[PDB]
Design a protein around this ligand. Structure first.
Ligand SMILES: CCCCCCCCCCCCCCCC(=O)O
Ligand SMILES: CCCCCCCCCCCCCCCC(=O)O
Ligand SMILES: [Mg+2]
Lengths: 187, 193
C-alpha cells in the first residue's frame, strides 16, 4: 500500500512534472483513496522527499552490500557506477524524476533533497578514503573534490541520456566512465 | 546585430532580481524598477520574463566562450589551454555571485521547453570543450582512445558541480582557489598526482 503509492508517485511526477502533479492524481494511480496518502505523508513535498529517501536508501544499501563483498577498491567503484546506471536504465520514469524533477529552485525543498543525497555522497567519501588508505588513490587526493568529480560526471552522463530520450544503452557507458574517472584525461 | 542602449541595464537588473527573489517571484515590474525604467520600456526589448532570461543567458555565454577561445589561442600547450578554460569558468562566476545564483540555481527549471532552450545555449561552450579535447588528442597530450563526448561530460559536469557547491555555500570561499586542483584532477583522475 505504501509501495504502490511510491510507485505511483514516480509515475505521476514523471508524466506531469512535480508542480503539476497532484496528490489526488497519485492516489488514483495507486488505487487508493485521497485519505490513504495522508496516513503516510503530511503532503505533496513529503511525497517527493519520501520517494527519494526510499529509492536512495535502498540503492545505497544494495551498493554497500555489493561493495562489502568486493575484493578490490577499483571494483567497488565499478559496482557503484554500474548500480547507478543499471537502476536508472531499468526505470526511465524514475530517471525523469531524478534528473529532471528533483532539480528544484525552492530553497527549503532543495535543501531537503540534498540532505537525502548525502547518503550517496557519504558512501563516495568512504570509498575515496578507503582508496587513499589502501594506496589505490594518491595520498594527496582531495576527497570533496573527487566526490564532486565522480557524482558530477555520473549525473551529467545520466542527464544527457535522459535528454536524448533514453535512446542508447546507458549501461554500456559503465566501463568507459569508470576508466575515465580512475585515469583522467592525460595520455 | 547590435543591442539597444537599455539592453544591459535591463539584463543586469534581471540578474539581480532573479538572484535575490528567485525566478518565480521575479516579475517584469520589479525588473523595470531595478533597471530604472517604465514597464513598457521592458516590453520594447523583451516579451516576458522568460525571454529576458534566455536572452541574457545567450548573450553572456556567447561572450564567455569568445573570451575563452581567444585566451586559449594565445597559448601553446593544451595543458595550459585546459587550465585557461577552468580558470575562466571559475573567474567569470567568482566575479558575479548574483549571476552564479542564476546559472546554478535559477536556470535549473523543469519547464521542458525552457530547458531545451538553455541546453541549446550551452552547446556553444560544449563545442569549445570538444575542440580542446580533439586538439589534445591529436598532439598526444590526451589519451588517444578517449571518447570526446564522455570527456566533455566529465569536464563540464565536474566544473558545474564544483561551482554549484560554492553557490550552495553562499559563495563564501574563493572559488578560484580550486582552479589548480580541479585542473589536475581532471588530468590524472583518482589514480595519479
Ligand atoms: C532501483 C533503485 C532505485 C534507486 C536509483 C537512484 C540511484 C541514482 C540516483 C542518483 C542521484 C541523483 C539525484 C540528485 C538530486 C539532486 O541534485 O536534485
Ligand atoms: C557567463 C556564464 C558563465 C557560466 C559558466 C557555465 C555555466 C553553465 C551553467 C548553465 C547550465 C544549464 C543547465 C544544466 C545542464 C546539465 O548539466 O544537465
Ligand atoms: Mg551537474
Amino acid at each position: 500500500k505504501y509501495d504502490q503509492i511510491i510507485d505511483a508517485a514516480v509515475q505521476v511526477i514523471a508524466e506531469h512534472g512535480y508542480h503539476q502533479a497532484q496528490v489526488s492524481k497519485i492516489a488514483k494511480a495507486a488505487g487508493v483513496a485521497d485519505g490513504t496518502i495522508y496516513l503516510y505523508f503530511n503532503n505533496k513535498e513529503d511525497v517527493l522527499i519520501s520517494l527519494f529517501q526510499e529509492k536512495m536508501g535502498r540503492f545505497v544499501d544494495k551498493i554497500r552490500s555489493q561493495m562489502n563483498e568486493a575484493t578490490d577498491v577499483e571494483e567497488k567503484l565499478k559496482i557503484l557506477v554500474n548500480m547507478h546506471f543499471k537502476q536508472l536504465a531499468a526505470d526511465h520514469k524514475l530517471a525523469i524524476v531524478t534528473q529532471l524533477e528533483l532539480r528544484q529552485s525552492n530553497t527549503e525543498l532543495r535543501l531537503k533533497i540534498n540532505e537525502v543525497l548525502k547518503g550517496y555522497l557519504n558512501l563516495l567519501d568512504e570509498l575515496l578514503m578507503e582508496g587513499k588508505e589502501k594506496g589505490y588513490f594518491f595520498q594527496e587526493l582531495d576527497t570533496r573534490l573527487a566526490r564532486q568529480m565522480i557524482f558530477g560526471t555520473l549525473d551529467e552522463v545520466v542527464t544527457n541520456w535522459v535528454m536524448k530520450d533514453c535512446k542508447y544503452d546507458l549501461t554500456a557507458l559503465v566501463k568507459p566512465v569508470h576508466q575515465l574517472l580512475l585515469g583522467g584525461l592525460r595520455h
